[PDB]
Every structure is written in structure tokens, then in C-alpha cells.
């Protein structure tokens, strides 16, 4: 004689809680993100399956910043070649909130997985590259650096739509301020890491993203990473092993003197010609590749010029490659704050998805 | 050719494939094509159990690769604190420079890893 009411379960998955409320059902584990599991679920309102990532960042300041940045950037961004946030689920109160679930479009596959099983047609390499740059145009126009482009952050569906995802490593850098010395030092996935990052420490710019696209194109041409270094020194090794030793001009543009000194310590190396590496590749592709995989970030092609390159002529349409209308500004960069305060900021950003929210 | 197989397993967080190779007399200081040892690889990936048994089977704690990179440098770059502590406990030189002139301390200053810095001062 007490209302033997029996509602029970948060759904469970591999023993962890996956509490995505009555709207998301039929869970299926689909691997790991940075701070939790990802499940795919059926969205009972939109009638499609989606991807939901569980995030638990509240213990560590840097998990908090990375989570907050992904949230604020992607909630403001709106573009076809960038993943969106469809919904965000968390506890009604800041004390109860230990986890945050981010809901996104589910994409069949991604380029890392595609390259493991598939020699891409030149039409594919081309159309994929067009879409990476189109999305990147927009990212960059927002004063955002992505900082981790690589095949597995390029989501893909079967109509060959391509969307860039995983913005946890992204960041604003408003160019009305000087950022030399302010940028986090060890960024990008190694094989995709521009030489300046290990050379002009904390002084790189949005062109590191171009270098990564460079590495991706090279990868799409031969199904093998072009620079598979084992550690930072070996990574540098693999780059100079193909670009050849840097010129004297290029060298005298290394800001950091210890780096310059080290570069001088190295035996000379010959450039390896692009078509020696890729004898089958379309030679205009090889021209663009040369432009993006330029040692000196200042001579390296930029996003809007890469779109205009002869290789992408079939798709290039400036009137159909939008930029961000409200670029991000210096004040949004100030997330060096206590994990508790970041938690409040995450709490306040996610409010607008809480049940019943008005406005 | 055991060293090779053990290299490839210290990389891959194969706690058991490593434990077995050890018991088949695999060389703990197997050198890879770049002068990297199994300790290098396990410390780089934060595979603590593996680091620990490699040490127990005699792994050279101050091994340099052809770049002057030591296990300590690698544990430091990815901020693997536990492993760092254990490498020190086993006598890794905190002053070792790679051929770039970097020490595990420099790395911790470069990464703003305040926690890793204290650990290297004690």
C-alpha cells in the first residue's frame, strides 16, 4: 500500500548510463569520442536515426574548454559541409549535470574508413576536395581554426555529401589581435601537423588547416598517409624527406632560433618530385597539392585561392560558397577560466535545448 | 624474430601479447628501424602496465632513439603523469636533450602542463 509505481530504467550501454530520455530510443554503441561513448539512436521526432555523443568533461579544465568551444562554435555555424548540433541533452540543474549529450546527423561513413577499403575515382577525389575547402572557407571566414583536419573527421554519406566534424580542437583567433605566443602548442594529429607547429611554437595561423588538407589530398591519391612520422622529430623528418631541405629564404623566416639551429644541423635533402610519388595522379591535382604542402606558411595557398584552382573548375562557384555572417571576435577566446565557471558557461549555452525553454 | 613482434605489440596496448613474448625470451631492448625500443612505444601511448613489466625485464630506461628521444620525452609530450613518475623512480635522466635541444622539462613548459612540471622538479 504505496503506489507501486514502476517506471525505472535509464537505458544502459556497456554498463554506463546513456540517458537520452524518451525522445531517443533503440541505442547502438558506435565507438568512442574524446570524453565518452557515442551511440546511434532513433529520433522519435524527426523519424531518423542520429548520432549521440556522451561527454563528461567536468573534472578537467581542458575538457571543459574543448567542450565549450565545440558547443559555441557549432551552434553558431550553419553550413552544408560542417556537422550541426541538432539537440543537446543534460540535467535540469547544474549540480545534477555530470554529463552532456550532443545529438548530430548520422553519417554512414567517413573518409578514413573509405580510404581503408577504396581506391577513389578521380571524380571522387575532386568532389571530396571541393567540399573540404568549401566548408573550410566558411570556418576560416569565421576566424576559426579547426586544428585537426584528417580523414576520420570528414563524415560521408552515400550521396557523397561530405561534412567536417570534431571541433573539440578548434579555436577562434581574431586577427585584430596578435596571437604570437598565445596559441596552444601541440595541436593537430601528428601525421597532419604543419611544420610550423613544431617549428614556430605557439605562432601558427589558420594555414595549418591548409597543410592538413594537403596531407588529406595526398592520402586520397594513394591510400597511404604521406607523412607517417613516429614522433615530432620524425614527423619533421618525413616532411623534409619529400619537400627537401628548406630554402635559404624559407629558413630565414623561421622565427624560433632553436628551430633554425636544428634545421641547419640536418644533412641536405633533395625535393622528391610530386609525380615521382604520384605517377598516376592528375597533374593539376599535383599542382594544387604542391601549393598546399608548401613548407613556408606565408607562401602556402589560402582557402579562397584553392577553390579557384584549375583542378576544382567543375564545381567552383563563389556565389555558392558562403562565409560566416557574424565572424567570432577576441572576447569569445577568453576561456582560460576555472573548471567550475566553464561548467556554468556550458550550462548557460545548453539551456536553449531544455524541455519547455521559451525563446 | 621476436623483437619485431614485441615492438609491434608494445605499440598496440597489447598487455598480454607483450607478457607472452617476454616469456618466449623476446629481447626487451629490441630496436626498431629508428632506434625506438618497446619502452619508448609503451610510454608514448600511456600503456602503464606494459611500461612496468618492460622495466622489470630489464628495459633500458634511458634509451635514445636516432633523434635523441627518450622514453621520458615521450611520456612527457602526451602528459602521461603516472608513467613519468615510474620512469623517474627507475632513474631516467631528467636532463636528457633530444637533438632539437628539448628536455622533458622544456616540453612541460612548452605545453603549459603545470602538473608535469612539479613532477619533474621533485
Tab-separated table of C-alpha atoms in Angstrom:
chain	number	residue	atom	x	y	z
A	1	UNK	CA	0.000	0.000	0.000
A	2	UNK	CA	2.207	2.727	-1.549
A	3	UNK	CA	1.697	3.446	-5.247
A	4	UNK	CA	3.767	0.528	-6.512
A	5	UNK	CA	4.580	2.710	-9.467
A	6	UNK	CA	7.240	1.092	-11.638
A	7	UNK	CA	8.911	3.499	-14.175
A	8	UNK	CA	12.651	2.512	-13.619
A	9	UNK	CA	15.421	2.448	-16.310
A	10	UNK	CA	17.901	4.962	-17.571
A	11	UNK	CA	18.947	2.890	-20.662
A	12	UNK	CA	22.356	1.226	-20.083
A	13	UNK	CA	25.180	0.580	-22.576
A	14	UNK	CA	28.316	-1.422	-21.814
A	15	UNK	CA	27.483	-0.734	-18.195
A	16	UNK	CA	27.486	3.045	-18.464
A	17	UNK	CA	24.358	5.257	-18.287
A	18	UNK	CA	23.081	6.560	-21.658
A	19	UNK	CA	20.206	8.655	-20.646
A	20	UNK	CA	18.694	10.177	-23.736
A	21	UNK	CA	15.191	10.456	-22.401
A	22	UNK	CA	12.153	9.251	-24.210
A	23	UNK	CA	12.929	11.024	-27.489
A	24	UNK	CA	15.979	8.888	-28.491
A	25	UNK	CA	15.489	5.139	-28.473
A	26	UNK	CA	16.996	1.991	-29.971
A	27	UNK	CA	20.532	2.705	-28.914
A	28	UNK	CA	23.535	1.222	-30.640
A	29	UNK	CA	27.136	1.696	-29.429
A	30	UNK	CA	29.275	3.187	-32.248
A	31	UNK	CA	32.649	3.752	-30.600
A	32	UNK	CA	34.495	6.387	-28.549
A	33	UNK	CA	34.739	10.215	-28.632
A	34	UNK	CA	37.169	12.246	-26.536
A	35	UNK	CA	35.194	12.227	-23.220
A	36	UNK	CA	32.639	9.482	-23.686
A	37	UNK	CA	30.881	6.854	-25.748
A	38	UNK	CA	28.949	7.513	-28.895
A	39	UNK	CA	25.648	5.789	-29.628
A	40	UNK	CA	23.379	5.948	-32.602
A	41	UNK	CA	19.666	6.269	-31.708
A	42	UNK	CA	16.343	6.631	-33.357
A	43	UNK	CA	14.965	10.113	-33.175
A	44	UNK	CA	11.318	9.681	-32.431
A	45	UNK	CA	10.513	13.245	-33.590
A	46	UNK	CA	12.479	13.511	-36.796
A	47	UNK	CA	11.983	9.820	-37.673
A	48	UNK	CA	15.595	9.076	-38.498
A	49	UNK	CA	18.488	7.559	-36.742
A	50	UNK	CA	21.003	10.100	-35.271
A	51	UNK	CA	24.442	10.031	-33.559
A	52	UNK	CA	24.578	10.969	-29.891
A	53	UNK	CA	27.880	11.584	-28.081
A	54	UNK	CA	28.098	11.416	-24.276
A	55	UNK	CA	30.521	13.957	-22.884
A	56	UNK	CA	31.808	14.014	-19.280
A	57	UNK	CA	34.266	16.902	-19.088
A	58	UNK	CA	33.580	18.472	-15.708
A	59	UNK	CA	36.626	17.197	-13.828
A	60	UNK	CA	39.252	18.788	-16.015
A	61	UNK	CA	39.629	22.354	-17.103
A	62	UNK	CA	40.859	21.491	-20.575
A	63	UNK	CA	37.994	19.033	-21.212
A	64	UNK	CA	35.710	21.905	-20.271
A	65	UNK	CA	37.274	24.360	-22.652
A	66	UNK	CA	37.318	21.941	-25.506
A	67	UNK	CA	33.668	21.038	-24.902
A	68	UNK	CA	32.601	24.675	-24.569
A	69	UNK	CA	34.370	25.693	-27.788
A	70	UNK	CA	32.852	22.868	-29.753
A	71	UNK	CA	29.457	23.821	-28.484
A	72	UNK	CA	29.663	27.564	-29.070
A	73	UNK	CA	31.273	27.241	-32.490
A	74	UNK	CA	28.985	24.617	-33.937
A	75	UNK	CA	25.770	26.255	-32.503
A	76	UNK	CA	26.719	29.431	-34.396
A	77	UNK	CA	27.984	27.785	-37.556
A	78	UNK	CA	25.466	26.915	-40.282
A	79	UNK	CA	26.839	25.378	-43.481
A	80	UNK	CA	26.298	22.195	-45.553
A	81	UNK	CA	29.854	20.841	-45.198
A	82	UNK	CA	30.020	21.260	-41.426
A	83	UNK	CA	28.290	18.972	-38.893
A	84	UNK	CA	25.483	20.709	-36.892
A	85	UNK	CA	24.213	20.308	-33.382
A	86	UNK	CA	20.566	19.152	-33.535
A	87	UNK	CA	19.931	18.879	-29.828
A	88	UNK	CA	21.779	18.863	-26.524
A	89	UNK	CA	20.576	16.909	-23.505
A	90	UNK	CA	21.557	17.375	-19.867
A	91	UNK	CA	20.175	17.548	-16.314
A	92	UNK	CA	17.729	20.309	-15.358
A	93	UNK	CA	20.132	21.679	-12.721
A	94	UNK	CA	23.775	22.475	-12.683
A	95	UNK	CA	24.530	20.217	-9.672
A	96	UNK	CA	22.815	17.198	-11.279
A	97	UNK	CA	24.621	17.725	-14.552
A	98	UNK	CA	27.618	15.392	-14.748
A	99	UNK	CA	27.087	14.523	-18.419
A	100	UNK	CA	26.177	16.340	-21.638
A	101	UNK	CA	24.828	14.531	-24.731
A	102	UNK	CA	25.290	16.121	-28.091
A	103	UNK	CA	22.963	14.962	-30.883
A	104	UNK	CA	24.083	15.197	-34.567
A	105	UNK	CA	23.210	13.905	-38.074
A	106	UNK	CA	24.281	10.315	-38.529
A	107	UNK	CA	26.560	9.854	-41.457
A	108	UNK	CA	27.095	6.373	-42.932
A	109	UNK	CA	30.828	6.505	-43.210
A	110	UNK	CA	33.916	8.763	-43.320
A	111	UNK	CA	36.948	9.217	-45.389
A	112	UNK	CA	39.373	7.347	-43.065
A	113	UNK	CA	37.133	4.302	-43.349
A	114	UNK	CA	36.571	4.830	-47.082
A	115	UNK	CA	40.316	5.016	-47.803
A	116	UNK	CA	40.911	1.744	-45.898
A	117	UNK	CA	38.815	-0.111	-48.444
A	118	UNK	CA	38.668	2.047	-51.553
A	119	UNK	CA	40.854	3.380	-54.377
A	120	UNK	CA	38.935	6.620	-55.120
A	121	UNK	CA	37.987	7.628	-58.639
A	122	UNK	CA	39.395	10.987	-59.723
A	123	UNK	CA	35.825	12.310	-59.739
A	124	UNK	CA	35.640	11.339	-56.101
A	125	UNK	CA	38.957	12.812	-55.035
A	126	UNK	CA	37.896	16.016	-56.762
A	127	UNK	CA	34.395	16.401	-55.414
A	128	UNK	CA	35.553	15.484	-51.943
A	129	UNK	CA	38.328	18.071	-52.064
A	130	UNK	CA	35.913	20.695	-53.318
A	131	UNK	CA	33.691	20.082	-50.298
A	132	UNK	CA	36.515	20.126	-47.735
A	133	UNK	CA	37.628	23.554	-48.987
A	134	UNK	CA	34.081	24.911	-49.249
A	135	UNK	CA	33.436	24.125	-45.634
A	136	UNK	CA	36.853	25.310	-44.693
A	137	UNK	CA	36.229	28.705	-46.435
A	138	UNK	CA	33.418	29.272	-44.060
A	139	UNK	CA	35.295	28.028	-40.946
A	140	UNK	CA	38.158	30.395	-41.738
A	141	UNK	CA	35.913	33.322	-42.595
A	142	UNK	CA	34.545	32.890	-39.017
A	143	UNK	CA	38.112	33.488	-37.714
A	144	UNK	CA	38.102	29.893	-36.628
A	145	UNK	CA	40.979	27.427	-36.889
A	146	UNK	CA	39.878	23.759	-36.949
A	147	UNK	CA	43.295	22.368	-35.964
A	148	UNK	CA	42.581	18.634	-36.517
A	149	UNK	CA	41.573	18.041	-40.094
A	150	UNK	CA	42.164	14.432	-41.063
A	151	UNK	CA	40.246	11.760	-42.943
A	152	UNK	CA	38.352	10.469	-39.943
A	153	UNK	CA	36.962	13.921	-39.207
A	154	UNK	CA	35.441	14.060	-42.669
A	155	UNK	CA	31.985	12.409	-42.439
A	156	UNK	CA	30.420	10.929	-45.585
A	157	UNK	CA	27.083	9.686	-46.792
A	158	UNK	CA	26.160	7.667	-49.774
A	159	UNK	CA	25.297	10.584	-51.984
A	160	UNK	CA	28.907	11.710	-51.435
A	161	UNK	CA	27.973	14.650	-49.227
A	162	UNK	CA	30.969	15.459	-47.061
A	163	UNK	CA	30.790	17.177	-43.643
A	164	UNK	CA	33.648	18.232	-41.443
A	165	UNK	CA	33.182	17.244	-37.801
A	166	UNK	CA	35.048	17.097	-34.420
A	167	UNK	CA	35.629	20.717	-33.421
A	168	UNK	CA	36.924	19.945	-29.932
A	169	UNK	CA	40.368	21.057	-31.059
A	170	UNK	CA	39.041	24.218	-32.760
A	171	UNK	CA	39.566	27.757	-31.595
A	172	UNK	CA	38.878	31.387	-32.518
A	173	UNK	CA	41.788	33.644	-33.308
A	174	UNK	CA	40.509	37.086	-34.070
A	175	UNK	CA	43.127	38.739	-36.350
A	176	UNK	CA	42.649	42.213	-34.864
A	177	UNK	CA	44.745	40.873	-32.032
A	178	UNK	CA	48.203	39.379	-32.082
A	179	UNK	CA	48.256	35.758	-31.086
A	180	UNK	CA	52.035	35.038	-31.217
A	181	UNK	CA	52.788	33.071	-28.026
A	182	UNK	CA	49.059	32.669	-27.048
A	183	UNK	CA	48.085	29.620	-29.110
A	184	UNK	CA	48.154	26.104	-27.615
A	185	UNK	CA	51.278	24.355	-28.679
A	186	UNK	CA	50.647	20.724	-29.545
A	187	UNK	CA	47.809	20.740	-31.963
A	188	UNK	CA	46.634	18.674	-34.991
A	189	UNK	CA	47.017	14.896	-35.346
A	190	UNK	CA	50.729	14.189	-35.980
A	191	UNK	CA	50.686	12.994	-39.482
A	192	UNK	CA	48.630	16.077	-40.373
A	193	UNK	CA	50.632	18.593	-38.423
A	194	UNK	CA	52.103	21.518	-40.298
A	195	UNK	CA	55.858	22.049	-39.991
A	196	UNK	CA	55.485	25.430	-38.346
A	197	UNK	CA	53.607	23.933	-35.392
A	198	UNK	CA	56.735	22.055	-34.339
A	199	UNK	CA	58.881	24.992	-35.507
A	200	UNK	CA	57.115	28.425	-34.876
A	201	UNK	CA	55.804	27.184	-31.484
A	202	UNK	CA	52.571	28.962	-30.442
A	203	UNK	CA	52.834	31.294	-33.549
A	204	UNK	CA	50.975	29.356	-36.272
A	205	UNK	CA	47.838	30.568	-38.138
A	206	UNK	CA	44.782	29.273	-39.894
A	207	UNK	CA	47.038	27.966	-42.684
A	208	UNK	CA	47.836	24.922	-40.620
A	209	UNK	CA	44.377	23.776	-41.761
A	210	UNK	CA	45.577	24.091	-45.334
A	211	UNK	CA	48.586	21.894	-44.681
A	212	UNK	CA	46.229	19.255	-43.281
A	213	UNK	CA	44.039	19.421	-46.364
A	214	UNK	CA	47.291	18.987	-48.287
A	215	UNK	CA	48.017	15.815	-46.370
A	216	UNK	CA	44.474	14.569	-46.953
A	217	UNK	CA	44.629	15.084	-50.728
A	218	UNK	CA	47.971	13.208	-50.825
A	219	UNK	CA	46.264	10.462	-48.841
A	220	UNK	CA	43.275	10.345	-51.218
A	221	UNK	CA	45.711	9.898	-54.120
A	222	UNK	CA	47.446	6.832	-52.807
A	223	UNK	CA	45.528	5.460	-49.840
A	224	UNK	CA	48.514	5.931	-47.547
A	225	UNK	CA	49.390	8.806	-45.238
A	226	UNK	CA	52.043	10.847	-46.938
A	227	UNK	CA	53.981	11.719	-43.740
A	228	UNK	CA	53.641	8.921	-41.142
A	229	UNK	CA	56.193	10.193	-38.575
A	230	UNK	CA	56.578	8.333	-35.267
A	231	UNK	CA	57.109	11.435	-33.021
A	232	UNK	CA	57.642	15.229	-33.550
A	233	UNK	CA	61.203	14.925	-34.616
A	234	UNK	CA	60.455	12.066	-37.005
A	235	UNK	CA	57.463	13.993	-38.389
A	236	UNK	CA	59.756	16.836	-39.374
A	237	UNK	CA	61.982	14.157	-40.828
A	238	UNK	CA	59.218	12.797	-43.047
A	239	UNK	CA	58.285	16.251	-44.362
A	240	UNK	CA	61.862	17.352	-45.295
A	241	UNK	CA	62.302	13.911	-46.743
A	242	UNK	CA	59.894	14.915	-49.521
A	243	UNK	CA	59.764	18.690	-49.713
A	244	UNK	CA	63.576	18.562	-49.426
A	245	UNK	CA	65.601	20.801	-47.144
A	246	UNK	CA	64.081	24.280	-46.793
A	247	UNK	CA	65.450	27.077	-48.954
A	248	UNK	CA	67.641	29.795	-47.555
A	249	UNK	CA	64.829	32.407	-47.779
A	250	UNK	CA	62.348	29.992	-46.122
A	251	UNK	CA	64.806	29.150	-43.441
A	252	UNK	CA	65.464	32.819	-42.619
A	253	UNK	CA	61.718	33.096	-41.960
A	254	UNK	CA	61.848	30.630	-39.049
A	255	UNK	CA	61.032	32.796	-36.075
A	256	UNK	CA	62.354	30.486	-33.439
A	257	UNK	CA	66.140	30.360	-33.332
A	258	UNK	CA	66.480	26.965	-31.721
A	259	UNK	CA	64.341	25.569	-34.613
A	260	UNK	CA	66.503	27.344	-37.198
A	261	UNK	CA	69.589	25.941	-35.482
A	262	UNK	CA	68.182	22.434	-35.608
A	263	UNK	CA	67.199	22.784	-39.261
A	264	UNK	CA	70.820	23.702	-40.012
A	265	UNK	CA	72.009	20.647	-38.118
A	266	UNK	CA	70.403	18.375	-40.753
A	267	UNK	CA	72.052	16.732	-43.839
A	268	UNK	CA	70.854	18.227	-47.087
A	269	UNK	CA	67.846	16.543	-48.768
A	270	UNK	CA	66.605	16.656	-52.347
A	271	UNK	CA	62.967	17.526	-53.051
A	272	UNK	CA	61.086	14.444	-54.258
A	273	UNK	CA	59.055	15.383	-57.337
A	274	UNK	CA	55.340	15.121	-56.934
A	275	UNK	CA	54.799	12.907	-59.982
A	276	UNK	CA	57.594	10.603	-58.891
A	277	UNK	CA	55.371	9.969	-55.829
A	278	UNK	CA	52.081	10.018	-57.668
A	279	UNK	CA	52.747	8.877	-61.266
A	280	UNK	CA	49.035	8.234	-61.850
A	281	UNK	CA	47.661	11.399	-60.316
A	282	UNK	CA	46.024	14.124	-62.392
A	283	UNK	CA	48.709	16.706	-62.803
A	284	UNK	CA	46.514	19.644	-61.815
A	285	UNK	CA	45.731	17.865	-58.566
A	286	UNK	CA	49.530	17.671	-58.172
A	287	UNK	CA	49.819	21.374	-58.827
A	288	UNK	CA	47.242	22.184	-56.110
A	289	UNK	CA	48.928	19.694	-53.765
A	290	UNK	CA	52.258	21.459	-54.267
A	291	UNK	CA	50.580	24.744	-53.305
A	292	UNK	CA	49.085	23.414	-50.091
A	293	UNK	CA	52.053	21.410	-48.955
A	294	UNK	CA	54.293	24.433	-49.002
A	295	UNK	CA	56.809	24.483	-46.130
A	296	UNK	CA	56.509	28.268	-45.554
A	297	UNK	CA	53.016	29.099	-44.197
A	298	UNK	CA	53.257	32.504	-45.893
A	299	UNK	CA	53.708	31.176	-49.377
A	300	UNK	CA	51.133	28.482	-48.780
A	301	UNK	CA	47.916	28.725	-50.774
A	302	UNK	CA	44.850	30.054	-48.892
A	303	UNK	CA	41.320	28.614	-48.853
A	304	UNK	CA	39.668	31.107	-51.328
A	305	UNK	CA	42.568	30.667	-53.819
A	306	UNK	CA	42.479	26.907	-53.547
A	307	UNK	CA	38.822	26.912	-54.512
A	308	UNK	CA	39.728	28.998	-57.615
A	309	UNK	CA	42.454	26.483	-58.653
A	310	UNK	CA	42.102	24.831	-62.111
A	311	UNK	CA	41.523	21.392	-60.550
A	312	UNK	CA	38.195	22.425	-58.988
A	313	UNK	CA	36.894	24.309	-62.036
A	314	UNK	CA	33.946	21.908	-62.438
A	315	UNK	CA	32.484	22.912	-59.020
A	316	UNK	CA	33.906	26.328	-58.213
A	317	UNK	CA	31.083	28.788	-57.657
A	318	UNK	CA	31.945	31.783	-55.390
A	319	UNK	CA	28.292	32.843	-55.353
A	320	UNK	CA	27.627	29.343	-53.845
A	321	UNK	CA	30.425	29.207	-51.288
A	322	UNK	CA	29.079	31.191	-48.283
A	323	UNK	CA	31.036	32.818	-45.490
A	324	UNK	CA	30.074	33.349	-41.857
A	325	UNK	CA	27.918	36.466	-41.435
A	326	UNK	CA	28.984	37.112	-37.846
A	327	UNK	CA	32.695	36.321	-37.515
A	328	UNK	CA	33.868	35.447	-33.974
A	329	UNK	CA	35.780	38.012	-32.013
A	330	UNK	CA	38.514	38.239	-29.461
A	331	UNK	CA	36.203	38.173	-26.368
A	332	UNK	CA	34.894	34.768	-27.236
A	333	UNK	CA	38.540	33.479	-26.998
A	334	UNK	CA	38.830	34.091	-23.237
A	335	UNK	CA	38.048	30.656	-21.922
A	336	UNK	CA	41.024	30.372	-19.577
A	337	UNK	CA	38.725	30.015	-16.542
A	338	UNK	CA	38.154	27.658	-13.591
A	339	UNK	CA	36.505	24.324	-14.488
A	340	UNK	CA	33.569	25.405	-12.228
A	341	UNK	CA	32.980	28.574	-14.230
A	342	UNK	CA	33.328	26.768	-17.516
A	343	UNK	CA	30.656	24.422	-16.267
A	344	UNK	CA	28.360	27.411	-15.713
A	345	UNK	CA	29.112	28.642	-19.194
A	346	UNK	CA	28.267	25.189	-20.631
A	347	UNK	CA	25.155	25.150	-18.544
A	348	UNK	CA	24.025	28.508	-19.907
A	349	UNK	CA	24.836	27.664	-23.563
A	350	UNK	CA	22.859	24.455	-23.478
A	351	UNK	CA	19.770	25.952	-21.808
A	352	UNK	CA	18.059	26.690	-25.050
A	353	UNK	CA	17.575	22.935	-25.687
A	354	UNK	CA	15.979	22.161	-22.231
A	355	UNK	CA	12.342	20.962	-22.350
A	356	UNK	CA	9.943	23.918	-22.323
A	357	UNK	CA	12.517	26.624	-22.837
A	358	UNK	CA	10.881	29.845	-24.017
A	359	UNK	CA	12.582	31.803	-26.858
B	1	UNK	CA	62.028	-12.822	-34.944
B	2	UNK	CA	60.655	-11.783	-31.580
B	3	UNK	CA	61.839	-8.207	-31.042
B	4	UNK	CA	59.870	-7.054	-34.033
B	5	UNK	CA	56.696	-8.805	-32.818
B	6	UNK	CA	57.253	-7.247	-29.345
B	7	UNK	CA	57.789	-3.761	-30.755
B	8	UNK	CA	54.510	-4.052	-32.671
B	9	UNK	CA	52.685	-5.173	-29.520
B	10	UNK	CA	54.075	-2.568	-27.086
B	11	UNK	CA	52.713	-0.011	-29.573
B	12	UNK	CA	49.285	-1.552	-29.604
B	13	UNK	CA	48.497	-1.717	-25.867
B	14	UNK	CA	48.618	-5.475	-26.047
B	15	UNK	CA	49.173	-6.137	-22.333
B	16	UNK	CA	49.026	-9.961	-22.871
B	17	UNK	CA	50.719	-10.309	-26.291
B	18	UNK	CA	53.564	-8.496	-24.580
B	19	UNK	CA	53.504	-10.624	-21.431
B	20	UNK	CA	53.788	-13.753	-23.560
B	21	UNK	CA	56.538	-12.516	-25.884
B	22	UNK	CA	58.597	-11.720	-22.739
B	23	UNK	CA	58.139	-15.326	-21.605
B	24	UNK	CA	59.452	-16.553	-25.011
B	25	UNK	CA	62.713	-14.711	-24.461
B	26	UNK	CA	61.932	-11.660	-26.633
B	27	UNK	CA	64.682	-9.074	-26.472
B	28	UNK	CA	63.459	-6.196	-24.252
B	29	UNK	CA	65.606	-3.671	-25.944
B	30	UNK	CA	64.651	-4.674	-29.456
B	31	UNK	CA	65.492	-1.732	-31.644
B	32	UNK	CA	63.255	-0.559	-34.396
B	33	UNK	CA	64.367	0.942	-37.636
B	34	UNK	CA	64.656	4.403	-35.949
B	35	UNK	CA	66.237	3.316	-32.699
B	36	UNK	CA	62.891	3.079	-30.835
B	37	UNK	CA	62.578	0.358	-28.142
B	38	UNK	CA	59.465	-1.280	-26.656
B	39	UNK	CA	59.696	1.002	-23.632
B	40	UNK	CA	59.611	4.032	-25.988
B	41	UNK	CA	56.443	2.854	-27.600
B	42	UNK	CA	54.571	1.854	-24.475
B	43	UNK	CA	55.449	5.079	-22.686
B	44	UNK	CA	54.433	7.118	-25.734
B	45	UNK	CA	50.901	5.547	-25.703
B	46	UNK	CA	50.437	5.690	-21.933
B	47	UNK	CA	50.310	1.913	-21.553
B	48	UNK	CA	51.351	1.818	-17.895
B	49	UNK	CA	51.200	-1.978	-17.116
B	50	UNK	CA	53.370	-2.592	-20.125
B	51	UNK	CA	55.962	0.059	-19.199
B	52	UNK	CA	56.201	-1.525	-15.822
B	53	UNK	CA	56.915	-5.080	-16.920
B	54	UNK	CA	59.341	-3.955	-19.554
B	55	UNK	CA	61.289	-2.303	-16.734
B	56	UNK	CA	61.053	-5.424	-14.658
B	57	UNK	CA	62.500	-7.468	-17.616
B	58	UNK	CA	65.467	-5.005	-17.829
B	59	UNK	CA	64.365	-2.317	-20.323
B	60	UNK	CA	66.898	0.400	-20.811
B	61	UNK	CA	65.120	3.364	-19.149
B	62	UNK	CA	67.409	5.966	-20.814
B	63	UNK	CA	67.398	4.571	-24.318
B	64	UNK	CA	67.882	7.149	-27.066
B	65	UNK	CA	66.450	6.760	-30.478
B	66	UNK	CA	68.212	8.105	-33.567
B	67	UNK	CA	66.683	11.522	-32.694
B	68	UNK	CA	67.898	11.641	-29.110
B	69	UNK	CA	64.332	10.978	-27.933
B	70	UNK	CA	63.990	9.100	-24.742
B	71	UNK	CA	61.063	7.283	-23.158
B	72	UNK	CA	60.821	10.198	-20.699
B	73	UNK	CA	60.334	12.711	-23.539
B	74	UNK	CA	57.546	10.670	-24.969
B	75	UNK	CA	55.652	10.221	-21.676
B	76	UNK	CA	56.068	13.948	-21.223
B	77	UNK	CA	54.780	15.081	-24.615
B	78	UNK	CA	51.342	13.380	-24.170
B	79	UNK	CA	51.306	14.241	-20.424
B	80	UNK	CA	51.295	10.687	-19.098
B	81	UNK	CA	51.974	11.570	-15.442
B	82	UNK	CA	51.853	8.088	-13.915
B	83	UNK	CA	54.361	6.787	-16.420
B	84	UNK	CA	56.526	9.824	-15.902
B	85	UNK	CA	56.628	9.105	-12.155
B	86	UNK	CA	57.625	5.488	-12.769
B	87	UNK	CA	60.355	6.399	-15.254
B	88	UNK	CA	61.897	8.734	-12.728
B	89	UNK	CA	61.542	6.115	-9.977
B	90	UNK	CA	63.593	3.875	-12.338
B	91	UNK	CA	66.298	6.556	-12.980
B	92	UNK	CA	65.521	8.216	-16.300
B	93	UNK	CA	67.730	11.357	-16.691
B	94	UNK	CA	65.549	14.395	-16.475
B	95	UNK	CA	68.228	16.427	-18.259
B	96	UNK	CA	68.400	14.349	-21.477
B	97	UNK	CA	68.047	16.605	-24.541
B	98	UNK	CA	66.676	15.395	-27.845
B	99	UNK	CA	68.682	16.526	-30.921
B	100	UNK	CA	66.421	19.555	-31.006
B	101	UNK	CA	67.779	20.631	-27.612
B	102	UNK	CA	64.465	19.870	-25.765
B	103	UNK	CA	64.340	18.220	-22.323
B	104	UNK	CA	61.271	16.669	-20.677
B	105	UNK	CA	61.187	19.807	-18.599
B	106	UNK	CA	61.229	22.123	-21.653
B	107	UNK	CA	58.299	20.151	-23.043
B	108	UNK	CA	56.299	20.659	-19.908
B	109	UNK	CA	56.897	24.414	-20.098
B	110	UNK	CA	56.036	24.439	-23.797
B	111	UNK	CA	52.699	22.577	-23.105
B	112	UNK	CA	51.762	24.559	-20.039
B	113	UNK	CA	51.379	21.314	-18.203
B	114	UNK	CA	51.833	22.737	-14.668
B	115	UNK	CA	51.235	19.360	-13.056
B	116	UNK	CA	54.001	17.680	-15.117
B	117	UNK	CA	56.448	20.484	-14.225
B	118	UNK	CA	56.215	19.910	-10.414
B	119	UNK	CA	56.687	16.234	-11.006
B	120	UNK	CA	59.961	16.915	-12.802
B	121	UNK	CA	61.256	19.193	-10.030
B	122	UNK	CA	60.752	16.713	-7.189
